[PDB]
Design a protein around this ligand. Structure first.
Ligand SMILES: CC(=O)N[C@H]1[C@@H](O[C@H]2[C@@H](O)[C@@H](CO)O[C@@H](O)[C@@H]2O[C@@H]2O[C@@H](C)[C@@H](O)[C@@H](O)[C@@H]2O)O[C@H](CO)[C@H](O)[C@@H]1O
Length: 572
């Protein structure tokens, strides 16, 4: 059946979440938390991005009873279906994805429980603008018939030419079980027929359990082995709450005690560092939480959205991610087996991650090593997870080091694609500068990055194109009146409503921008003083870069002082 949309490297997808306000629904009003509206939100999306963005409805705290989610969803599907573009005056139905399964669809957790497969089929038939359905976050409540239900969602989507999109994390072997590890094989068999209509994403919310790397490995491997059409990630600023962090760089752990302050605190640019792990490995679907901080409120873009996500998403449209063909050519090792039997996220710590609790990598040398669970058949060295090479940290590196050569110097994350070096500082909550030395041919480039900074350096015919992002606003005001972790833990709760109000009042406006901070780029093998061209970036966020040319040493030091996004070319 003809696909309702394309999702691939040239046609990536940004999911745009809208969360139902259940309190207001009880009063007969149809509204979203944060005050976005379906029509206003769509209208605000830049026209260039509209072909690649889909509205994702989520039932959030709708009443947990029959009829509530169906009622709210039908209301919104009608709004989407009859939208009129005014400019054009033409009816242009808004593309929609419905959230249909979450928290195991337990009747004590979600109104989505009372959305039948029969109702889903009827919606797809009624609304050509319904492009897919979404299951999200079930690892902690792995319902008895989850795999059976997932098979039904995939089939009903394939029947109608829509996509079934599942965002899940390998906590408690979730991804392995989905494909039949524990004998529940309905979904495995569904995928054998309908993988062209499946999108599989990570969901990095449960940061305390450290399953980021293994989940992403699986996502990439399932894609490479034709067990999902495309893959991606849902990146979640609640990870800061899950790991008990508070004020940026501060000592002490406050555990899960200040939720609504905590999901605001993750550095804006760190979401781009996370998203790079998707792009660089051929993933093409992106989604974020908490929506109020990552997207915005009241139909306006937050600064995280405008300065990081929108720029990054424009980048992956203009430079499509590597194709399956290409990723597959580049893969030297493919793992077959269950990470859950080999320490789960611990498998990669001190291989390509610096700690158990991180969504980042410490080296791009192996990029992301792809895997599929042991229940799947295979169907490049394909290596069983139980083989001697994987028995320990050192063994893993020895084996991988023969097949993936060292291709840069320095304690920093860097990965190369064609003429481009992608670089970031991998520290999460420690204020440590990092440095690296990268080579194009010939041209040798050193960089020094503070934490929460990524750059893309592209060798061009007359020099170097640079895109830099270190956007990080000051969140200290949220942690005012707390001199240590003990005092922070006891602050009055910000609350969900208070945090939305803080965003309106102190983020969307009256922003406490962060201090400008220094990045250095050193070019070696240089004949003359390079010149800077096409300089642009976040408004009022950067000084004019400074150059220092040592003619005898064929080298130039470029000093940038900034806090935001930035782009320019050097000609030489
Ligand atoms: C109780 C609450 O504050 N709920 C809002 C909050 O929900 C997320 C957090 O509570 C997070 C803590 O790490 O746990 C996540 O489970 C939860 O996500 C929401 O619930 C799960 C089961 C899934 O359905 C998710 O899609 C959903 O977001 O933050 C979200 C927005 O990030 C909402 O405001 C919740 O109402």
């Amino acid at each position: 059946v003809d696909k309702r949309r394309e999702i691939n490297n040239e046609h990536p997808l940004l999911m745009m979440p809208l969360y139902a306000n259940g309190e207001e629904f009880n009063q007969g009003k149809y509204t979203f938390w944060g005050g976005d509206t379906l029509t206003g939100k769509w209208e605000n999306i830049p026209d260039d991005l509209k072909p690649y963005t889909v509205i994702q409805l989520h039932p959030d705290d709708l009443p947990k009873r029959d009829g509530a989610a169906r009622d709210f969803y039908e209301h919104m599907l009608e709004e989407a279906a009859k939208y009129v573009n005014p400019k054009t005056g033409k009816n242009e139905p808004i593309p929609v994805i419905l959230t249909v399964y979450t928290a195991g669809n337990m009747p004590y957790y979600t109104s989505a429980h009372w959305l039948s497969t029969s109702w889903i089929d009827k919606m797809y038939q009624k609304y050509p603008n319904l492009h897919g359905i979404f299951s999200t976050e079930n690892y902690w409540i792995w319902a008895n018939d989850i795999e059976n239900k997932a098979a039904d969602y995939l089939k009903v989507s394939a029947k109608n030419g829509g996509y079934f999109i599942w965002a899940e994390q390998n906590n408690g072997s979730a991804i392995e079980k989905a494909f039949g590890k524990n004998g529940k094989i309905a979904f495995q068999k569904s995928v054998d027929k309908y993988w062209k209509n499946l999108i599989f994403m990570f969901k990095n919310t449960p940061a305390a359990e450290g399953n980021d790397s293994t989940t992403e490995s699986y996502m990439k491997g399932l894609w490479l082995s034709n067990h999902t059409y495309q893959w991606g990630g849902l990146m979640d600023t609640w990870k800061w709450y899950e790991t008990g962090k508070w004020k940026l760089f501060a000592s002490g752990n406050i555990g899960k005690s200040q939720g609504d302050r905590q999901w605001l605190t993750e550095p804006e640019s760190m979401l781009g560092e996370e998203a790079l792990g998707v792009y660089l490995n051929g993933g093409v679907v992106y989604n974020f939480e908490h929506p109020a901080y990552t997207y915005g409120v009241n139909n306006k873009e937050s600064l995280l959205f405008s300065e990081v996500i929108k720029e990054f998403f424009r980048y992956v449209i203009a430079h499509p991610a590597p194709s399956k063909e290409k990723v597959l050519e580049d893969t030297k090792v493919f793992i077959h087996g269950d990470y859950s039997n080999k320490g789960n996220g611990k498998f990669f710590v001190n291989v390509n991650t610096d700690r158990e609790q991180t969504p980042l990598y410490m080296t791009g040398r192996y990029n992301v090593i792809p895997a599929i669970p042991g229940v799947l058949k295979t169907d490049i060295q394909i290596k069983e997870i139980t083989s001697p090479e994987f028995s320990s940290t050192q063994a893993r590196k020895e084996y991988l080091n023969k097949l993936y050569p060292m291709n840069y110097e320095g304690d920093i994350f860097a990965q190369k694609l064609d003429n481009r070096w992608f670089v970031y500082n991998y520290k999460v909550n420690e204020n440590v500068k990092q440095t690296g030395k990268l080579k194009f041919n010939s041209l040798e480039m050193n960089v020094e990055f503070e934490p929460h900074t990524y750059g893309i350096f592209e060798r061009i015919s007359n020099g170097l194109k640079v895109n830099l992002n270190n956007f990080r606003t000051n969140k200290d005001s949220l942690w005012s009146n707390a001199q240590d972790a003990n005092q922070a833990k006891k602050l009055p709760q910000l609350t969900k409503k208070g945090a939305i109000k803080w965003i309106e009042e102190h983020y969307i406006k009256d922003t406490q921008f962060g201090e400008k901070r220094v990045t250095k780029i050193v070019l070696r093998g240089i004949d003359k003083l390079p010149t800077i061209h096409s300089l642009s970036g976040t408004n009022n966020s950067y000084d004019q870069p400074s150059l220092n040319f040592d003619q005898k040493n064929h080298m130039v030091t470029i000093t940038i002082n900034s806090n935001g996004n930035l782009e320019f070319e050097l000609h030489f």
